[PDB]
Design a binder for these strands. Sequence first.
DNA 1: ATCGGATGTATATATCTGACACGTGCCTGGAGACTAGGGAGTAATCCCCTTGGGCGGTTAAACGCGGGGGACAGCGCGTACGTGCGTTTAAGCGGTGCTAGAGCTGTCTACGACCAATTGAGCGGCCTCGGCAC
DNA 2: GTGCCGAGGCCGCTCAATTGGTCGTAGACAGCTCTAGCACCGCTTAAACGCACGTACGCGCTGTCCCCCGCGTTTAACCGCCCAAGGGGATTACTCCCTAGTCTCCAGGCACGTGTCAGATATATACATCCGAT
Lengths: 91, 98, 104, 93, 77, 79, 89, 92
Amino acid sequence: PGTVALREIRKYQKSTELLIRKLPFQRLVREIAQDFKTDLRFQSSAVAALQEAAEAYLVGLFEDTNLCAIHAKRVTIMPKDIQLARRIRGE
Amino acid sequence: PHRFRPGTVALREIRKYQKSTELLIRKLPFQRLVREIAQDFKTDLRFQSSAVAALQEAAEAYLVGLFEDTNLCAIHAKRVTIMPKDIQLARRIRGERA
Amino acid sequence: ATSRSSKAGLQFPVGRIARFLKAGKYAERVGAGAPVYLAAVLEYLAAEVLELAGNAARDNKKTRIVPRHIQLAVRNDEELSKLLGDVTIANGGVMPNIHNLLLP
Amino acid sequence: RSSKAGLQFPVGRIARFLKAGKYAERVGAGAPVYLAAVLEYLAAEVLELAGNAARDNKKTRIVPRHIQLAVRNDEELSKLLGDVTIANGGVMP
Amino acid sequence: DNIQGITKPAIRRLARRGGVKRISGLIYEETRGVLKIFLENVIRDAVTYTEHARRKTVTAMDVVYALKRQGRTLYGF
Amino acid sequence: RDNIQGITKPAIRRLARRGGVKRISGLIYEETRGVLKIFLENVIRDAVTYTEHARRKTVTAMDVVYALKRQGRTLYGFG
Amino acid sequence: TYKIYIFKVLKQVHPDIGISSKAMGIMNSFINDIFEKLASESSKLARYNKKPTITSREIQTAVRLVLPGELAKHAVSEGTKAVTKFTSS
Amino acid sequence: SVETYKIYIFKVLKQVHPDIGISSKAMGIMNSFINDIFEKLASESSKLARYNKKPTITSREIQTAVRLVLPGELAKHAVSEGTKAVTKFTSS
DNA sequence: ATCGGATGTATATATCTGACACGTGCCTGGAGACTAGGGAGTAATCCCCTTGGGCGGTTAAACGCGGGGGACAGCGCGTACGTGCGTTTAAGCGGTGCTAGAGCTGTCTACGACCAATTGAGCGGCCTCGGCAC
DNA sequence: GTGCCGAGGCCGCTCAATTGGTCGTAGACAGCTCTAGCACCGCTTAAACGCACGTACGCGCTGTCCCCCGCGTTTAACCGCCCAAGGGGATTACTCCCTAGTCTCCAGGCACGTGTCAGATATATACATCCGAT
C-alpha cells in the first residue's frame, strides 16, 4: 500500500494525453448547458477545448491542495485541504 | 498588583483595531522608506504629497489581507501562533511569487 | 429644448455619456440607444450602493454617509462583494472577524 | 519595405494591424518598426529554448511539450506566461 | 446524473499528475463539486458570446474568449 | 539606509491585530519587513515609469493609481 | 465629475441622509470604473464580430458578461425600460 | 484568405536552429503567442497615449509599453533591440 | 458554584469646530435642423457539419478481500511570548521662507493621412520521402 | 524489423504593400507666471524600547484502530467503424432606414463666496465584566 502510488505519480507527469474519458465529459457539458439555452449544439473542437482547460484546472488545484496537507504534517489529502486552497486563491 | 491573563488584552485589541479606520504606521518613516526605494529607478525625484498617502493606504490594505490568511494557515495546522511558514504557504498558493 | 435625460426619464447625463463614448474611440459609430441604456444601468447601480450605504449609516445612528458605511454595505452583500471583489475603499476598514477558535 | 531594417517580420502588415484596430488617430513611422523588432526578438528567444529542449529528447522536431518545458524552466518567460495553458503540454515533473 | 461519469479512477489519475500520494475517500464528492462550479462558470459566458452572434452552435472560439475573460489563456485551441 | 527598520514591531502587531491574529512568533517581523519591500518595489517601479513617460519629475497620484489598477489592486478615493 | 447626479439619486432613496466629500469621491471613482469596464467589453464584443457600431445590444451583452447574476438581471430590465421610454415616448 | 505569422516564425527558426523543424501544433502555439503579445503591447500603448492627451502613437511609447508589459531582464534586451532597428531604419 | 473586588466600555452631559449646503458668475455645451453616404438587415442558395441508427472490440471500471501504516488522541516538558512598568527617542504640532517644478500660450517647421498606379509579397492547393512510430 | 505518413517543397496568383505628391495640423519648442514641494528650527508628549516574570502553548513520544492500498475476477462502458437525411453557418444581394458631419440659439453643470449645523471630544456616571480565592 503506497508502492505503485509512486509509479503513477511518475509516469503521469511524463505523458501529455487526456485523463478523463471523452464521451462522459461531453455528455456532462451538454447537460449543464441545457439550463442556459435549449436546443444548442457544440462544435467538436469546442468540447476538446473545455476538457483541456478543466483538466488543467483540476491538476493545478490538486498540487496546492497537497502543499496544505504537508503543511499540516500529513501525506493524505482530505476535503479540508481543498477548501483551504480555494479559500485563499479566491474562488 | 492586578494582572490580566495572557491573551485577554490581545482580544480587546483585535476588537479595537477592527472598529477604527485610522492609518497604523508612522507617516515620516514610511515616506523615507518609499523615497529610499524610488531612489534607484530615477534619482532626484519629487513626490506629490497625495501620492505617498495613496501608497501607504495601498500598502496597509495588502498586509492586512495577507495576515488574515496566514492566520488561516496557522489554524489549519492546529495552532494559534503564526510563524513564517504560514506567510510562505499563503504567498505560494496565491502566486505572489510562487 | 428638452434634454435626452428627460425623454429617457433618468437622472444621469445621457448627452455627456454619449460624448464620453465618442471620445475614447471605442468604435467608429455609436447608436442612439447605447448612451440611454448605459446611463440607465449606471443610475441603477448607483442607487443600489447608495441605498445599502444609507441603511448602514442609520444602523450606526448617523445621518451622513462616510467611507466606512460604503465598505460595510459592499462587503456585506453577495453580488456587490463579488463585483467589487478586489477593490480597496480608502479610509474604510475591515469588518469585525474573530475566529471561533480564539475566544476562550 | 522591411528589408532596410534587418528584420524578418512584416512591418507593413504590422502597420496595417495597428491602423485597423484604431488604437489611436495617428501612427508614427518608427512604431511598426519598433513593434516588429520586439516581436521577432521574443519569437527567437522562445524558439531557441524549445529547440534546446528538443535536442535533449533526441528529437529533431519541436512539439508542444517542448514549448511547455522551455517556458516552465526559464524564470522570465514563466513570469510572462504565468497564467497560460499550452494545449497538451503536460506538466513539469 | 452525468456528474458521476467522472469516475474515481479518473480523479486519482488527476491527483497522481498533481503529485498526491494518498487520497481520502471523501475527496471524490468534493472534486466532483468544484469541477461543476468551474465548468458552469465558463459555459455560461461561452453561451452568452454565442447568442450575441445570433448563432445556434457553440464554436471553439467562444470557449477561448470565455476562458480569457477569467484570467486563463488557452494556446493552440 | 535602515529605513526599513522604521517599520517598527508595534506597528506590525497593530496590522496583525486588524488582521485577526492572536499570537505572533518572534520571527514574523523580519519576514513582514521583507515582503513589504517587494510590494513597494513593484508598485514604485511602475509609477516611476508612468512619471518618466510624461516627462515630469514628480511622481503624482494617478501614476500610483494607474500602477495599482494594472496589477489587480483597484483603489477608490484618490481620483 | 458625476457628483450632482449622484446627489440627486440619494435624495430619491434617503431624503434625509447626507454624504461627505470623501464618500462622494468613492462614489465618483466607482461610477468611472464601471463605465469603463462596460465600454471596453462592448468594444471587444463589436470587434469579435467585425461590426463598426456599438448599439444597445453590445451594452446588454456587456452587462450580462460583467455584472453578477441577480444584479445583471435587474440592470438589463432597467436599461430596456429606459430605451423603450426613449423611443416610444 | 487566412493570414498568419507562419513564414516569419519559420524563417526565424531556420535562423536560430538551422536543422530543427517544427510540427503544426507547435506552429499554432507560436502563432497564438505572437498574437497575444502584439495585442498586449498595442492596447497598453493606446491606453497610455490616452492618459496623456495625444492622438499619436510614436515609438517612444512602444518603449514604455514594453517596459510595463515585459518583466525585468526580458525588457532590457527587447528595448535595446528595438532601438537598434529604428536607427538602422532611418539612418539608412 | 457564586461572589465581590477591580478595570472596561457604554450612556449622557456639553461645547466646539469646519465643514455640507445653498447664494451667486460666466463659460462652454448639449440640443435642434439639414444634408450624405453607406451600414444595417433580411432576403435567397449552396453546402459542410452537425447529429442519431445501428456492430464490434478491448479496454477500463466496479466489486471484494487481506493487512499494514498512517491519522489521531493523550501525556510531559520547557521555552518563547504576553502583560505591565519605568526610561528614552523621535514623530508631530506649528512658524519661516524658497528654489524647482508644473501649466499655459504663441509660432513655425516637419510629419502623417489620403489617393493614384504598380508587382511582388503573402495565401491554398498540387505532390514526394524521409523519421519516429510503430 | 515493418510500414505508411506528416513535414517540406512547388506552385499560379492577385491582392496587398511601395513609391510619389499634397495638404493641413500635431508636435516640438521658447517665454513667463504661480503654484506646488522641500527644508530648517524649537517644543511637547506620545509612542517606542528595554526588562522581568510566568505561564500556557508548541513539540515530541507512544499507543490503537481503521481505512486506504494492492491484487485478482467479472461486468459494462467508451472508441471504434460505418452510415443517415437533419439542420446551421458563413456566402452574396438591392434596399432604406439610420450614422456623422457643419452649424444657431438657448441651455446646464463647474467655480468661488458665504453660514448652520452635527458628530467630536472631554468630563462625568453607572453597568458590565475577568480574576482569584475560597
